[PDB]
Each structure stands twice: as C-alpha cells, then as structure tokens.
Ligand binder design. Structure first.
Ligand SMILES: COC1O[C@H](CO)[C@@H](O)[C@H](O)[C@@H]1O
Ligand SMILES: CO[C@H]1O[C@H](CO)[C@@H](O)[C@H](O)[C@@H]1O
Ligand SMILES: CO[C@H]1O[C@H](CO)[C@@H](O)[C@H](O)[C@@H]1O
Ligand SMILES: CO[C@H]1O[C@H](CO)[C@@H](O)[C@H](O)[C@@H]1O
Ligand SMILES: CO[C@H]1O[C@H](CO)[C@@H](O)[C@H](O)[C@@H]1O
Ligand SMILES: [Zn+2]
Ligand SMILES: [Zn+2]
Ligand SMILES: [Zn+2]
Lengths: 138, 140
C-alpha cells in the first residue's frame, strides 16, 4: 500500500517480493558496484528467501535481532559501463548503521524513516542491482 | 498512528516543526529565492481548514493548488551550504496531474522521493531563516 522509490535505472527486469511480516536478514553483494541483494523474511508462518540481481561481488550480511527494524536506506546510482545501476547501497536499523556497500559514486539518494520501517523490496535486476525500492509500514 | 514519517532532508539548524497528517492538503506554497525560504500549507484538519507557515519570511511565493482528484505523489530537492548553514536550496513536488518546481537556485546534495504507491498527507522538518529541512507524512 505504501511503496517508495525505485532508485536506479530502467535496465534489467522487474522484481517485487511484496511486504513481509519480518525481515530476517539482508545480504548485499557488492564489488565496485552493487551486484545483488538476498532478503530472507517471514511471511504468513513461513520463512522465505528471494535474491535479486545476479551473482557477482562479496557478501555483506545484515542480520536483524529481536527488536531491530530497518529505518533507513541510502545509496548512489549511476552509469557503470552502459547500465544505470546502484553503485553504492547502505541501510540503517534502530540499533546501528551498515555500509554503504559498492565503490562507484553517482547520483545520491537517501530515505531516512522518522516513523515506520522497511517491510520489503521491489525494483529491477540483471547482472547487477539496476534499481531498488521499498515497502513501508507503521 | 502509522503516521509513516519519511525524511527530514536538510540540515540540523533552525527549530523543529511538525504539522502532523491532514485529511486533505488543499495547497502548498513554496517561498523561494536563491534558496528555499519557506513553505505554507493550507489543509483540512478535523473539519477545520488551517494553514501553517513554515521556514522564514522569504523570497517569492509559488503556490501549488491541488484539485479534487489531485494528490502529492512526489517530492524532490537539493540541500547545501548557504552562508554557513545547510538548508534546502531547491525543492519540487509532483502530483498525479502535474509536476511543480523545482523552486530555488542553490545546488547541492540531491534527494528524491518517488512514491510508487500512496501519497503525501502532511509535513514536518526544521525552519529558521530558511527551510533547514523538510520531511513528509505518507498514507495509502
Ligand atoms: C563498498 O564495497 C566494499 O566494501 C565492503 C565493506 O568493507 C567490502 O566487504 C566489499 O568487499 C567491497 O570491497
Ligand atoms: C549486462 O547485462 C545486463 O545486466 C545489466 C545490469 O543488471 C542490466 O541492466 C541489463 O538489462 C542486463 O540484464
Ligand atoms: C570489477 O570487479 C568487481 O566488481 C564487480 C561489480 O560489483 C563484481 O561483480 C566482481 O565480483 C568484482 O568485485
Ligand atoms: C541565520 O540564523 C538562522 O537561520 C538558519 C536558517 O534557517 C538556521 O539554522 C539557524 O539555526 C538560525 O535559525
Ligand atoms: C539573496 O536574495 C534572495 O534570496 C533569498 C533566499 O532565498 C530570499 O530570502 C530573498 O527574498 C531573495 O529572494
Ligand atoms: Zn543470493
Ligand atoms: Zn561485509
Ligand atoms: Zn507564510
């Protein structure tokens, strides 16, 4: 019901995991660009994992503890050899800050969440994370 | 009390402001010179039509009058240093009908809030002489 962003480019193909009950972990694969994200989450009594955007890079796992929620997403998007992709990507929880991951500067974006949380993702993916957006909940 | 509050984009200067969410944003008026000086918002609180005056006195007004079917589904801008203070130097909004702005002429670190689903229902931020910062309430 509340979907924000898609920051990135038009390349790759669409993904959309919808909202979750709880995000368990977010694993950003990155080298000089953001290659991919794995999200594992619970959904109506089940645990699920998705992986958006290609093989590539080194993994950086954010694991969410008991009362921990994603309250921020930040990054940069730009042209990496002909595709507009997320060159840098970071997250913050109520407890700590992570990243950003990736080494390619571009047009910055930032989503601080003064009230609410990130409950899921949508965007575009191919060889790399072309774009990323976020579902929000109270 | 989801209010879902997104942002504050800008500096830590000035005094905090927070209008809460509205039943309906009637119009948003952005005061603008080489920086964003202020925002006035006229909206319907609980039966009543109030307006709030955020930021400072300012430069030149630019009014976005929303029409019945028209909702705010986007906010973009840039924040930067302006004589020793980090303020919003550029600010723009898009609705489901039209796109307004950006207003102001001081470039800086860009931000953007495309709302693929939902809309802006209210405003908060920081204000002094200019718009130090601005954020937004979201609802479906
Ligand atoms: C920003 O991109 C990287 O930085 C992280 C964090 O150190 C590394 O783990 C990763 O391999 C990349 O070199
Ligand atoms: C290299 O080819 C691809 O990978 C990039 C980056 O994800 C995409 O934008 C593109 O559409 C293809 O999927
Ligand atoms: C250029 O080499 C790298 O950067 C890319 C893009 O992020 C990764 O796929 C790869 O594993 C290396 O880290
Ligand atoms: C010039 O003095 C002030 O105006 C700026 C910009 O609004 C503020 O941060 C600051 O705290 C004071 O209120
Ligand atoms: C420097 O002159 C101006 O720019 C400032 C900041 O926007 C405004 O306060 C003033 O009204 C003029 O428009
Ligand atoms: Zn994976
Ligand atoms: Zn790591
Ligand atoms: Zn006013």
């Amino acid at each position: 019901a509340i979907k924000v962003g898609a920051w990135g480019g038009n390349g790759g193909s669409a993904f959309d995991m919808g909202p979750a009950y709880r995000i368990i972990s977010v694993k950003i694969f990155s080298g000089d660009v953001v290659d991919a994200v794995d999200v594992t989450f619970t959904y109506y009594g089940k645990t699920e994992t998705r992986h958006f955007g290609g093989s590539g890079g080194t993994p950086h796992e954010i694991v969410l503890q008991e009362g921990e929620y994603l309250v921020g997403m930040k990054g940069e998007f730009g042209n990496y050899h002909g595709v507009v992709v997320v060159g840098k990507l970071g997250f913050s929880t109520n407890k700590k800050s992570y990243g950003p991951f990736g080494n390619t500067g571009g047009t910055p974006f930032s989503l601080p969440i003064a009230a609410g949380k990130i409950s899921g993702f949508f965007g575009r993916g191919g060889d790399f994370i072309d774009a990323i957006g976020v579902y929000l909940e109270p």
